[PDB]
Amino acid sequence: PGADAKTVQDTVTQVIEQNMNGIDNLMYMSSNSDSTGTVQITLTFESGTDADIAQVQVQNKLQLAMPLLPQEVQQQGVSVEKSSSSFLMVVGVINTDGTMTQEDISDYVAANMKDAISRTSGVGDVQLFGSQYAMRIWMNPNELNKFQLT
Amino acid sequence: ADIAQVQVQNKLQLAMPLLPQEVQQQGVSVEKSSSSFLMVVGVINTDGTMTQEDISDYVAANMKDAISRTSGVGDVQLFGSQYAMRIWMNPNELNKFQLTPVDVITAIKAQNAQVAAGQLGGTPPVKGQQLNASIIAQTRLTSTEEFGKI
Amino acid sequence: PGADAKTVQDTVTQVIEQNMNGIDNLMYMSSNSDSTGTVQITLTFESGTD
Amino acid sequence: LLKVNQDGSRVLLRDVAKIELGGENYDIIAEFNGQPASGLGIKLATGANALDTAAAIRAELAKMEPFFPSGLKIVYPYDTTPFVKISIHEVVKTLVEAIILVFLVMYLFLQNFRATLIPTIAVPVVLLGTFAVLAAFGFSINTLTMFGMV
Amino acid sequence: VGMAYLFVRLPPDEDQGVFMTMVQLPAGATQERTQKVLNEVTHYYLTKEKNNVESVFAVNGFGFAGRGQNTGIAFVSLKDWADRPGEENKVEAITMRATRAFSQIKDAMVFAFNLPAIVATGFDFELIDQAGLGHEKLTQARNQLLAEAAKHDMLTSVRPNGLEDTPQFKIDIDQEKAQALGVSINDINTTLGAAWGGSYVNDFIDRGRVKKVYVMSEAKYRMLPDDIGDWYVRAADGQMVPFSAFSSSRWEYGSPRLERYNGLPSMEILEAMELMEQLASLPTGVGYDWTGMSYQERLAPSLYAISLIVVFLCLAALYESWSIPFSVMLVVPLGVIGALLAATFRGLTNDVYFQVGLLTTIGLSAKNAILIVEFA
Amino acid sequence: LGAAWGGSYVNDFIDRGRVKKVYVMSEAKYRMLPDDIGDWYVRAGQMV
Amino acid sequence: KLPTGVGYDWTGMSYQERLSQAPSLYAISLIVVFLCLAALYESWSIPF
Amino acid sequence: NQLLAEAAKHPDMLTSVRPNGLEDTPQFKIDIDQEKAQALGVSINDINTT
């Protein structure tokens, strides 16, 4: 979080990507790194390889790189999924009455019905269109200057 | 061999917390192995321009990784080493200035960082926002002179 | 070592089981967090799973 | 509590900030026909079957629907499944029509009703045996197989 | 004779019942400058296409061409196929009428399209920086080949897949000034990072569920470069120090997305039979690499000539004449005109569906011929 | 002792677009005999 | 009739007992047996 | 506690419905005073690790 493309590439993408060697049945590899601060590395295996064994090998090579990533990447949590590419289906949750805003509905979905769908067999990746809650604290620079704090 | 490796791996991570220190720093690696080389690929320079280190660095930075990812190739071993930024201290030099290698390490680690520092215009924005730029704090050093000016 | 039920049950148990997604052939999940400081998560897979 | 003043005054965190239960990130928001909404972008694991995974999601969402707060319903925008069922169920129809047509077509050419009952029992037997052959060879029923049978 | 000419004149995307609409704005565009475009799109669909579109569900900030604050995407689901009769109410027409109705919007890139099934049928292309050049040398070589896209046909619209460079704010910190003032570089860095990017601290319990606790500066104080001057740092002696006392600032250019291919910096570039002359079109030290569909397709009659030779031997054994077989395999080009003519009358090209019914009918005309030339 | 006689990996740097390593280590002339142990002083403000 | 927000679920031994089909397994065994015997005796009503 | 002793009313269809789990027991709550600690000059980290 709070990192640009050059920082993200230098500190995460290359460090992860210099360890992806000696993986069976691999055709090519391609990665992105954008100013939101997110890395995305895709490794494409040949037609007819065993997907779960491919994931096991990729994970084995990744656990050699985790000690080298920054604490802020590790805390967030990296992930390795063998999902496809195109959305199988998208569900939506609206509020007919008009009691809740986007934040409330996103919190309800994330807190109560995102984990049970991610554990259903056959689901590789779940993208949530919104955000869950978090005790958010908004600092005030004038107050911090007034009380001699940081 | 795939099943053999899997059931060596998941038998190893029962005895991974017993290792004192090297549980981190890219330690325990489980991978299939042969014993003898398929092939050795030499690299020489006819016109006297490069030496041991220059040749081995070229083949470490520019063709090692591509070969390690070719189809059917297992464990590639290099007969040399990639470049590093070597710093040769001088005990009769830091004793005249009452310094220590700990001070050298700290100064280098503080003046050669990649710092991630947010962006201006970032969400959640205020009504009437027109900017979305990124902020660039300090970056890593790239050359011998920059390292010399620390 | 030291933690009770609540301390184990929300600094370890909830964190561990919020990361159990993307595992094939899973039937259900259960866990215990007892005052001796031990947590115990059990995953049951479909019959025939390797 | 942050700090204590000279006279004994106290500086609390609320004096210098603005605590609020917001989202983890604000980058992404969604709207469904104008009104606010959220949702899940379910992908599909490699090798999974797309029709009995959607059924599993739909049967999981039926389990957490009674406990929804007041007036919170789910809708199903983009969803690639019902087309598959309709198309397969489309090809099958034409196949069953063809048996009646031949039982009539041949009846038209041979006017005995007794003798027109043999091909009408011959064609379904081979049709049903083909499915069993596929279930022995490890295939599935799809657009290609149903068109191969028609 | 006629057949030959006919089988060289012919060259099935379903309506799937649903499609998407991708939006992307010039780099540096704020979130609501994108919400306005999304609102234009949803209003256009849910009014002008009132008879086809059932719901939209436009989501802002997400995109298949990466994430970001400018990008956006809008799903859209149509009414039942039996309720949208015609050729003008299919997806193949809705997502031409809309896309031709979406060049009106300025400073946007709005397309409505439809997916296939498996993996456009174009030529996906890469530009690997194999020497060690840098980003400008490749950016300079990316448009040098793009500008040489004159000529004329699978070429046409050939552009990049990344994002062009954007202004960035560089803030430069002087170590000697910081040390002289007594402030600590860790304090500088953590103040800047926490105030302008956010900082995950630890967890808290919210209705029995573990959630995060963030720290960030209120939006009012981190919007303009002039807001840098509101943030102070405690020095060692206990005094606040503004950032102007140990920093400069300047505006420079940087790139929003950086891409790599097989571990090397790259830039991707998204009648005919796939540009074979795309390769030889050359700067310092750059390479070529095809991927996706281009790499797959690259890497028919050989298995078709062996099927016509085995049927003659299969027939020869049946009849025992070494000339009788000829008759059986002489009505192969007779029952192949029915498909060709029909196909070259409606424009059905040469899909796997028409190429498989060919074989069915030349395998049934043989049935027809044999059961009589046997009796004969 | 470690950084003088064995070398220490400090962090990375960017060389021609590739991430390399950074090591500190003593010059070879002062890491050859046992007698060189008394060449290295460790700070207390005085060195010992 | 428990208070709102409280649900129930079967686990362990009762989970599989619910999810799966015994009469359908032998019902088809009866017709398969009948058909085999009708093929044997080359007649009907002999199986009965 | 409502579902138990609520189903017991049916001893002809259900027998020995037991809770299978430990019950609430006393615990020794101790709280450190942030205001008092800060004043005297003792840090919560050292209090906790003592």
Numbering used by the authors:
A (entry chain A): 50 to 199
B (entry chain C): 100 to 249
C (entry chain B): 50 to 99
D (entry chain A): 250 to 399
E (entry chain A): 550 to 560, 565 to 672, 677 to 709, 711 to 828, 839 to 849, 851 to 868, 873 to 949
F (entry chain C): 750 to 793, 796 to 799
G (entry chain B): 850 to 869, 872 to 899
H (entry chain B): 700 to 749
Cite, word for word, the article reporting this structure.
While minor modifications were made to optimise buffers for compatibility with the polymers, purification with CyclAPols resulted in clear elution fractions containing relatively pure AcrB protein consistent with a one-step purification. Initial 2D classes showed a clear AcrB trimer, with a good angular distribution within the data. The resultant 3D reconstruction, processed with C1 symmetry, achieved a final global resolution of 3.2 Å with clearly resolved density for the secondary structure and in most cases the side chains. The local resolution is lower for those helices on the surface of AcrB within the membrane domain, where density for the side chains could not be unambiguously resolved. The structure is asymmetric and exhibits a clear cavity at the interior of the trimer, which after model fitting was devoid of any density that could be assigned to lipids. At both contour levels, no density is present that could be assigned to the bound lipids. Comparison of the maps or overlay of the SMA and CyclAPol structures demonstrates no noticeable difference between structures and only minor variation in loop regions. There were also no identifiable lipids in the cryoEM structure of CyclAPol-purified AcrB, despite the clear evidence of co-purified lipids as observed by TLC experiments. Therefore, the apparent lack of lipids in the EM structure is likely due to their mobility which prevents them from being resolved. There is no noticeable change in structure compared to other amphipathic environments, although lipids are not currently visible, and this represents the joint highest resolution AcrB cryoEM structure.
Here we use an alternative type of amphipol: a cycloalkane-modified amphiphile polymer (CyclAPol) to extract Escherichia coli AcrB directly from the membrane and demonstrate that the protein can be isolated in a one-step purification with the resultant cryoEM structure achieving 3.2 Å resolution. Using Escherichia coli AcrB, we demonstrate that these APol derivatives (henceforth distinguished as CyclAPols) are capable of solubilising the protein of interest directly from the membrane. AcrB is an ideal model protein for such studies as it has been widely characterised with high-resolution cryoEM structures being determined in SMA (3.2 Å),40 saposin (3.2 Å)51 and most recently in liposomes (3.9 Å). Here we have shown that a modified cycloalkane APol negates the need for initial detergent extraction whilst maintaining the applicability to high-resolution EM structures.
